[PDB]
Amino acid sequence: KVLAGKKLTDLDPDEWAKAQASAERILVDVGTGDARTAYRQAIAHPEWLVVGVDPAWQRMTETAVRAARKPAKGGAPNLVLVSSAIETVPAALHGVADEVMVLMPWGKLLRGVVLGEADVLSGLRAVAKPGAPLEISIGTSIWREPIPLEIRDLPELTPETVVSTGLTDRLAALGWQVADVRLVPHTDLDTISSSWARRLGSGATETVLHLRAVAVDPR
């Protein structure tokens, strides 16, 4: 269920428990893209256990190959890449995260966050410790044509409509107390969507809808 280089393997429960215990912070990145962003977090913060969770595991293989190398050769032993969908988080991920990040989501994860779909929101809450922040970062260019199929029937989510669509209340009901919602124009894309296809420092920016919440009791 975790990537080891180009292959999937069974996560050793003992090693998983020891890694969590040894970490200063456990960060769960839900939706990883090619997981270069998770890798860069892990490299910057060797005391963090950085857990990337994505069902499209083959996309993450380059990151996994790089992370498996010796530290001197760019290895990141504190990066754990998990093959799983968020709506069906396995028990081994329940209540582990000090912080949950949803950066540049696509597909069901994106649609779920925008609509405040219970299975996606509950899955996110399931992996969190009480008090853990949730940070969601959505690039707003997705609402400019061509709009991706997973949101093209939905009106653009803005800070005002996060309230008026009832998303803030759906979040609270499922255990995410919203703290801040804002647009952040000219956000450096490298901070939320690094890729092995794109050189770092390109200067690429985007307006990001940023939501922060805190893990609380549901219902």
Automatic annotation (TrEMBL):
It holds the Pfam family NpmA. Keywords: S-adenosyl-L-methionine. The keyword Glycoprotein does not apply. It comes from the Bacteria. Transmembrane segments: none annotated. S-adenosyl-L-homocysteine binds at D54, I86, E87, L109, S193, S194. This is rRNA methyltransferase. It comes from Catenulispora acidiphila (strain DSM 44928 / JCM 14897 / NBRC 102108 / NRRL B-24433 / ID139908). The lineage of its organism: Bacteria, Bacillati, Actinomycetota, Actinomycetes, Catenulisporales.
